[PDB]
Subunit: 489 residues, 4 copies
Amino acid sequence: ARFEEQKLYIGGRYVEASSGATFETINPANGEVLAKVQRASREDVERAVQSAVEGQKVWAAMTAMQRSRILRRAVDILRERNDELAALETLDTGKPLAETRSVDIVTGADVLEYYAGLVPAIEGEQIPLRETSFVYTRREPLGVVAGIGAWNYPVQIALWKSAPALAAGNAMIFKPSEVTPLTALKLAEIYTEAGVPDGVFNVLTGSGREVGQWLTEHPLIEKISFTGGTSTGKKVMASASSSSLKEVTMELGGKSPLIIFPDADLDRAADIAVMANFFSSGQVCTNGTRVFIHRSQQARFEAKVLERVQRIRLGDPQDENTNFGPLVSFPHMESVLGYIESGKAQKARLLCGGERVTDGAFGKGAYVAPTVFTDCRDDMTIVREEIFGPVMSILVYDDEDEAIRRANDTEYGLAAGVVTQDLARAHRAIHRLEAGICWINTWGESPAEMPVGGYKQSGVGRENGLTTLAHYTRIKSVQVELGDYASVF
Amino acid sequence: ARFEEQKLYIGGRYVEASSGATFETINPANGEVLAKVQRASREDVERAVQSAVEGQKVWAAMTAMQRSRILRRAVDILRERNDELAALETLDTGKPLAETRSVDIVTGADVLEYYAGLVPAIEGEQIPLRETSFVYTRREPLGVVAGIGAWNYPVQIALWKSAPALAAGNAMIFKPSEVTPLTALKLAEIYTEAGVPDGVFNVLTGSGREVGQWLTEHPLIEKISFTGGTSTGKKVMASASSSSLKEVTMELGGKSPLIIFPDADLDRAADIAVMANFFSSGQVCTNGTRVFIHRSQQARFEAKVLERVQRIRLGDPQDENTNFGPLVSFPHMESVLGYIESGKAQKARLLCGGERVTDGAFGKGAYVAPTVFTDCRDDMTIVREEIFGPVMSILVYDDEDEAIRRANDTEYGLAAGVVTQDLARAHRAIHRLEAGICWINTWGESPAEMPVGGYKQSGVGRENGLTTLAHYTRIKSVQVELGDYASVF
Amino acid sequence: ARFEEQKLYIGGRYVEASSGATFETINPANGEVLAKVQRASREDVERAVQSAVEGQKVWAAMTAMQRSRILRRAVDILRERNDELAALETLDTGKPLAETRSVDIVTGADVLEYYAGLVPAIEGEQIPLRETSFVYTRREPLGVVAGIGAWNYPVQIALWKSAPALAAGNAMIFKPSEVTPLTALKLAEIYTEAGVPDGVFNVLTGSGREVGQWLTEHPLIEKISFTGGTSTGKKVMASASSSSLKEVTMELGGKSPLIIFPDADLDRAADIAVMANFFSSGQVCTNGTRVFIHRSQQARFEAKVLERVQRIRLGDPQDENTNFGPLVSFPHMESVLGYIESGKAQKARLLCGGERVTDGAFGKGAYVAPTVFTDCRDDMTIVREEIFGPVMSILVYDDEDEAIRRANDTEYGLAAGVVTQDLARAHRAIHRLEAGICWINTWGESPAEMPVGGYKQSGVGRENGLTTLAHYTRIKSVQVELGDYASVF
Amino acid sequence: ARFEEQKLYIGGRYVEASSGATFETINPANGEVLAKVQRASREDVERAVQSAVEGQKVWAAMTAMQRSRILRRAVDILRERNDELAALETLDTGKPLAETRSVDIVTGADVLEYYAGLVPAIEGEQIPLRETSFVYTRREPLGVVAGIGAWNYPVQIALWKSAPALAAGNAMIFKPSEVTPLTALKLAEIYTEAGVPDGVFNVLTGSGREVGQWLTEHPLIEKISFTGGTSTGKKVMASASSSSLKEVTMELGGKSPLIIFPDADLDRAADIAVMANFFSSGQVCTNGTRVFIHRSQQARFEAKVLERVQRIRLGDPQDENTNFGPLVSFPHMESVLGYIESGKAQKARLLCGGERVTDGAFGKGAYVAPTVFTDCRDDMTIVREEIFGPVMSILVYDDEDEAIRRANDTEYGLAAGVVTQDLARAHRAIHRLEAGICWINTWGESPAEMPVGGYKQSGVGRENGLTTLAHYTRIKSVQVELGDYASVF
Ligand SMILES: [K+]
Ligand SMILES: [K+]
Ligand SMILES: [K+]
Ligand SMILES: [K+]
Ligand SMILES: [K+]
Ligand SMILES: [K+]
Ligand SMILES: [K+]
Ligand SMILES: [K+]
């Protein structure tokens, strides 16, 4: 009822889907139906893929600097529409305006900016073999690739995925989550306005079981990049493999440790603790959801953590003074409620919240109190499993080696971090932790330059940094024989 | 049996399997039983993993130059044992002595020697952020990895997969083909003698549906590297993915095009085409089994191909004089003979060969004659489908753009080559061919420095070159904060 | 007095010199005094050094992306002002407007644009030694650097030097040629407008022997980058070295060979010969001034050269239809004509040109006719010595090995080139040519991605490409001991 | 004389010099004439260059792995002869057998080993411009290069220079210090026994004023690599420049700061300080000769230094229990004693040593007792100038920002270090120190992987690491035009 019915974006304009079917997008701050959103048919996919083939041709026939200028011109617009975009993402996701205005488009574009400047730096190798022969390599685009996004940072992830793919000279078809489809359509508009050729960035709306699956199976898509949960990642990765051997990147979940050592400043430690857990209503995949403190310091540190959780400003995401909103959807609110009832039953001590909050307006939304449990153990459902909502488990320990031992004991391997003032301990410990994203006296900063991804079952491949751009090309080796050819026959 | 029963190799020695079962390996030249070989159990797979976990720790704790020296010592033993290992390879595969003595151990050891020099050159990055903070990255081992071998180049594949795996500080569990298990066990012996710690290279014998599967499923194995057919590679990759999101490299098959432009040296062209079809009796994955010839040279090209094929010395692979041997097995002979009958039924013109060679002793072995069809068309089964025996398909074309479009019109993408004396044409054509391994005026050479692998359904990732070494490490990113930390709560 | 008096540029504005001394800059087409220009004092050099030390701290304290955005903005302004700056370059140099509007500012800004995008890509290395020790490297700015410009491409050369220097976080003091000081001053206005901090790009006008030399001697300057003649470069590099051991870059002169092989299209070959000799009236350092023609092609080639030279449009460089202007000055013209008379005295055969053009208003300018000598020999002064005016020397050869030996028989080694259709010969001949800048079937194009500089006495170091950015940083190696320290004492 | 007359080494064997003149080499421990040594003539220089030019061709014509194997064999030989080369180095330098057996040959061979593995990793670049054009680079050998060695580490410096030069495809002519000519000749024998072609490594003995000068001036030598004092480096670098514009590398002297912060453990800070001043009897270029201690820790730091200095085992370098021998020469001893009197005369407090040791046999040798001065001031001659003997100057500071400003206030910039247990301080301070070689909580280790050399007036270029090998090649860019060529004429 609130916004007009959303169409598929294919070949540089909106087109009518050919399914007959729609879904609704719902503002989770207060249940308001934000839009009717068309669902792509299997033949819509065929059409988007044929569009991308003919478009990729156009874009890759440009010189590298012509592609860099078009991408930079898309970065200018994103800076220019920062606020109007952040307004939309907030209605779509329930995330506070104080974060969307300041992070989502700001880091989305930071990454696109970084890669736009690197287009001319994509190079191959030359290797001499003998006087009469040498080899050179070319790094070529994959062709049409496909991205499949999450609902927690919708426009940002849409940028972090398509920035490298387009910079590497690929056409991308993107599928936003059914939960949050709005700003990805806006990104498509913008890119077209930048001069990005028709077909180079198509968007298909719908569900993971339908349009997602049809994207992983399509014989003419050369790579799948996916962001989301581990159990889904497995199905997604198996589908791309068994259909046509696609190249893949997966950014998945984690249950990341944070080790406070006994020499840490505890004020620092608590700030890091609270920042690692409550930002975006605990809806960040890298969150430091397992907090280790020394036994000799659990009382003091539990003091400072409650002190700070007490003053989180829960409120309207629309409000400028809000720093904590609702969760992305109601379905997801009761998934989190289901872990908090799990923690309670398992004798885990509750230190604050745990209860859905409805006073005045709050009841028309999906609001959960920031929740903290303490005196936890390793076999607890809340300690072993990923929650994806504002729930912090706190664990006591007696020595360094034990803390590291326990930090590593997981199928997960996304992030990890340490709080100490000692040079030796800081490096020594971090070298021993099994995560791809490691922090020393900080948490959460993710620079365009820093490769990020998971160890173990949190990922395959990486995002950001120079490495990620390379992995959106394919290597062709060329051997040039300048002398005689010898045959045995 | 010609030899003693072949046992599993775990932890620097031979150990009894716990399956209660074996299989035979057979000499395809004469049907002699070479050995009985033990099948690994599920619990033997668990034993091999526990052994690799412990051994990898010891290997990783050495210096870079200590690992380098150990691997260079293994190279030295391989050069010394070249002729003996070549004689065993010839027994197990049927490949002529003239090939195993010059190619298999020479080039397998060339790659180990390459990576041994490169151990000290593996390095991370460092990226300043501001005065108060920087990042560094570590390239850490993956831990335990697994390789699954093919039967065309048994010891060479074992070396090409284990060399970068061990140079990068990992342990590998290797599963040789059931068809060809013998030389892989000898390579495990040599790594041990060289100084490689117990458990760093273990060998498990048995089948793909059983031991290949238990390897690709295991939660503690971090990466799978597999060489084999495209259909099986699809199953392997999907199992590696859906079980624990393992990293993967796939080297698969193809139907690789050779284009002979009308300005080519025709004798060079025919030398290349026969080398690209008939080396190792037509059982090389990169073979150029679609040969495009211009309409005006078809008759002259055919006479040149016929002349070379008539002087091929098919015989006993123990004779130094033989340059063309039996096929690897009797089942594989049957499949090839079926492709030959298909060619005939669909009315391609038989230029030469086209049957089993059975005169005298040859009737004991699995010998298929060097076979050339001509007047082929793109919809024929012999043209569409990988045969992996000695069958060349010659296809007529009229213009350059048509040859390249027909060359590229396949689900495969392993290799491609062009023959032309024109500078512009050579590079222009090669830049448009969609394959990872591209040759100008030559075929088949695969230098240690040159990364090799498939586009499309012919592979995922690469082997050889500087790049492949980087792909047996995982990136850890470490942000160091030296300043104040800010919290928004 | 076409323009008002031109002042020193120091600290983000124009400042009065303290010398009491000025020079006149003149238009070479007509003798018109364009402007009075101030000469920097020795006190003014000091003032510019202190200004640069302070501005560099400000520029290096910014983030990498802060610096990128500022240089990208300078590029936008250069793009807008292309036609204006070209007009002033034409006034100052005599170059046709058809060249300055297309080449000079276009290719100068291309290099700044290239480097602007790479600012965030500059990284150190990280090397693990053992569990308890690792090394990291930093690539830190050099600090204050100086560039000394040549008169043939005044603003392009100011761009090619300042761009990597600023991108790598340095401040630069630039000294334009006394012959062409006008466009360097506008570049400094542009940098300031884009937001480059005060003192990061300072410009000092006056002589090489006074102000050029005070810069090369100053103990706070870390690197000198110079473009000009070989004999001057020896003096400059010698002074930079003996004063305070500076880093140096040197882009010097040449006598570059172009080999025309007997399979070339003679229209392509003659098009390449004339471009390689007569662009910017023969005042390009990389010019291909020794043109090797096979005995069998000599007559037909000379006819095709004579034909192009007869339709060269020598005239007023303000006329868009001019493609061959006057030389930069009358002194220079005098030198050139002495070379021509030497060619005549030494019995070389004049194909065409060989005289000053004095008819109509041309007597007011420094115009020399496009000149071609043929029947030349290797011991001729016109063949041995760099002329730097529009004078081609044609030399006959009989075999390839002879042509290559003769091409390499020089103390110079800036550029070289070959024209042939043959794949094998193109690469093999170019691999044997002792020059840093090599062209197959083309001449003169110099992409921002392509490192360029001399072998032998034609240079030290390179400009452009990835490599050059690296060479405006200094390496610092940091070893972190995290374990015990052992003394033998 | 102890040994036979030493001859020039040219073309894989010893040859007679043609000067008619010798010099003597003296054992500094007892004053015995170890050997008469031939002075190379101007003409002997020409002979060595001509032999290098021919030998370089043969060496560069081998494959990368053939050169790798030959260099690795030279490593093997150096390992087996470690003890014998060590004994001869002790004779020539006076260094303790405890040092020469463990450091000099071990680490010189470590660097040779490192580069031997890297020969095959030297690659150029590939850059696509458009469909019709691309560029590739070649990294080619410089040709003939020269190394000029110092007397403090004669065989180690001979190997650190020749290793990357030979690894990159070059021949080197090497001139050892007149003070220490013996072990360089032995290295030339070992290279030839390893299979290095005749002329690839030639050795010329004699003075820098004469033979070093003849090498720096020779027009066929392409690069000079020099180790020694700053003032001599300035002359060598200027002569290399003005003669033929050679490439250069300079490793020169220093007055390197060691800053001990207040949290430092004083047992550790004192072990680092004595190892930083008295290893090699004070004769290491990177020595931490200015020791900054906080005012409030001065008293206690001084006690711990004296206690370690008192137990230094000065004695006969041929006795294994010696860990402190004579200086390299009597002239050098005389120079160190004049700095000692400068120190006294200028009223620095003598903490210990400060005279020559003349008891019994020592009076026959060149022994200066370990010396520490304290209460030193920044203007004192001992604090400003490089001494190159065993003289530590201790300096009080009061605040961090200050200690870092004092450390930096020098024209030198070779090494620096900090001792501190705090994380933020260790890294923040090192980042501000203007030195190429930086140590945290350690001193003196120089891994083969780690690029080392001087900031400011302490050097140009680097030795060791990946980057050094890169600087023993020249870049050639090759533009391949595959389409039409456009002329303006
Ligand atoms: K929604
Ligand atoms: K994984
Ligand atoms: K077999
Ligand atoms: K693929
Ligand atoms: K002028
Ligand atoms: K040079
Ligand atoms: K001596
Ligand atoms: K310097």
